[PDB]
Amino acid sequence: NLAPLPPHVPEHLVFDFDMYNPSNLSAGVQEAWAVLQESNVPDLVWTRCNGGHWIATRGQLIREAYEDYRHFSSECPFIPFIPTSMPPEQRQFRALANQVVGMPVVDKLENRIQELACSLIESLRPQGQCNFTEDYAEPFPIRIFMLLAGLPEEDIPHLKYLTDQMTRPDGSMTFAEAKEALYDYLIPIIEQRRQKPGTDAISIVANGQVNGRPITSDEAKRMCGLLLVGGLDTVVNFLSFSMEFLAKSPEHRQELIERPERIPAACEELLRRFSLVADGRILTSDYEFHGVQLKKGDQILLPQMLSGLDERENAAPMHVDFSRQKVSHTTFGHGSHLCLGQHLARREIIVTLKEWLTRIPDFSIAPGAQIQHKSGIVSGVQALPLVWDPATTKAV
Numbered sequence: 001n002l003a004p005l006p007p008h009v010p011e012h013l014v015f016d017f018d019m020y021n022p023s024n025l026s027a028g029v030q031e032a033w034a035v036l037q038e039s040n041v042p043d044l045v046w047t048r049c050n051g052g053h054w055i056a057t058r059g060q061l062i063r064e065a066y067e068d069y070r071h072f073s074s075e076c077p078f079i080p081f082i083p084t085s086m087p088p089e090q091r092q093f094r095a096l097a098n099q100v101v102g103m104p105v106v107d108k109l110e111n112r113i114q115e116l117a118c119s120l121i122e123s124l125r126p127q128g129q130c131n132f133t134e135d136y137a138e139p140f141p142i143r144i145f146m147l148l149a150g151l152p153e154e155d156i157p158h159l160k161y162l163t164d165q166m167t168r169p170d171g172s173m174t175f176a177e178a179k180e181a182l183y184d185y186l187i188p189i190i191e192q193r194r195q196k197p198g199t200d201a202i203s204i205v206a207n208g209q210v211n212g213r214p215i216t217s218d219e220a221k222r223m224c225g226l227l228l229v230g231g232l233d234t235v236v237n238f239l240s241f242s243m244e245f246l247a248k249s250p251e252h253r254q255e256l257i258e259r260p261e262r263i264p265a266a267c268e269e270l271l272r273r274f275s276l277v278a279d280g281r282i283l284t285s286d287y288e289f290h291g292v293q294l295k296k297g298d299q300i301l302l303p304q305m306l307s308g309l310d311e312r313e314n315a316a317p318m319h320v321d322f323s324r325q326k327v328s329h330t331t332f333g334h335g336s337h338l339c340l341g342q343h344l345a346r347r348e349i350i351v352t353l354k355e356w357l358t359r360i361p362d363f364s365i366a367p368g369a370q371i372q373h374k375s376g377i378v379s380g381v382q383a384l385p386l387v388w389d390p391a392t393t394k395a396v
């Protein structure tokens with residue numbers, strides 16, 4: 001499974017990390033990745049796993065490579081949708097996406113998000129147990145997308161099925177099939193709303209402009225597809241990491257119960273500690289980067305997760321401290337592809353925590369349960385069995 005070391009890569013830089021099955025995974029996925037930040041590991045390493053690729057291990061280099069788009073291209077953004085894989089066009093497509101998921105939209109949507117969170121939590125509250133990942137986290141971001149995009153509730157099971165196939169296929173559909181079925185769904189809606197628009201995200205995208213002309217159907221379906229898939233697994237898994245931590249740390253949980261005003265700052269610290277994305281780039285040319293010779297076409301993993309875990313960026317980085325004066329991270333990325341959904345995601349997180357902690361303040365991991373993580377481009381939580389006494393809860 002280890003690809004022989006290419007002639008340009010010096011042996012002293014080899015560290016055979018497997019981003020899909022890291023050695024230390026039972027200890028927690030962030031901890032498993034943090035092996036890359038041990039003192040005997042260089043700032044930039046080559047792994048022979050997954051075909052062989054570079055890994056930047058420190059926030060300084062991860063940030064720099066994301067800034068240097070001329071050398072570090074998004075044409076191959078994953079080891080091994082618009083605008084993921086691309087500057088003048090990129091800027092225009094992002095401006096358009098900001099029209100639909102920017103702060104003003106999020107601020108308008110906030111109480112609808114709260115109303116949805118409340119309905120979900122209240123459905124679970126009297127049971128005294130749930131698998132948080134399946135029972136709250138999975139249904140939540142897809143419903144928020146339907147709100148954002150003005151799509152009917154009845155379309156959820158099929159749309160959720162298609163997005164599930166793109167990331168966790170059961171085998172019924174190839175990636176290409178699931179993507180094309182998503183496009184089959186979106187195309188007539190985009191066409192309809194181009195001619196008769198509302199104020200929803202699809203209407204706004206369908207009526208956008210690029211290079212002085214109307215957005216095409218192909219461009220619009222790809223933008224809408226990315227806005228859909230981008231906010232699903234990231235939010236599901238991130239909420240799950242946060243809730244796992246809160247279930248296991250009654251002291252931190254109590255801090256947020258007593259001082260709910262600290263929740264937004266707590267969100268940011270959790271985003272740092274339980275960061276979860278690890279994307280990459282491809283070298284456009286031969287390039288010497290921090291004393292290391294990179295070759296045209298080499299792939300480089302630039303884990304967003306690692307920047308905030310770097311003790312050079314944050315002291316005692318594995319400790320959760322809601323009062324940190326400066327929370328440094330790249331959890332939503334850095335540079336020209338910075339997450340478009342970051343404002344919506346923060347609001348979903350904060351609303352979820354606020355509503356959960358006021359309705360179900362006291363909860364624990366089910367006894368005997370060992371929470372399992374998974375690793376990859378979006379790392380996550382396989383399941384989160386929680387238990388609580390319903391008499392300690394507050395009903396609608």
Ligand code: HEM
Nearest residue numbers: 083084230231234235238277279332333337339340341345
């Ligand atoms: C905790 C939640 C989220 C996290 C951690 C996250 C993380 C990221 C990261 C790291 C990137 C940059 C990827 C790269 O440079 O290779 C990104 C891009 C993106 N995200 Fe998110 N994301 C989250 C939620 C969302 C949501 C809710 C949406 C949609 C509403 C969304 C839509 C997008 C889109 C469209 C891009 C591509 C931007 C571009 O290429 O210009 N994300 N996200």
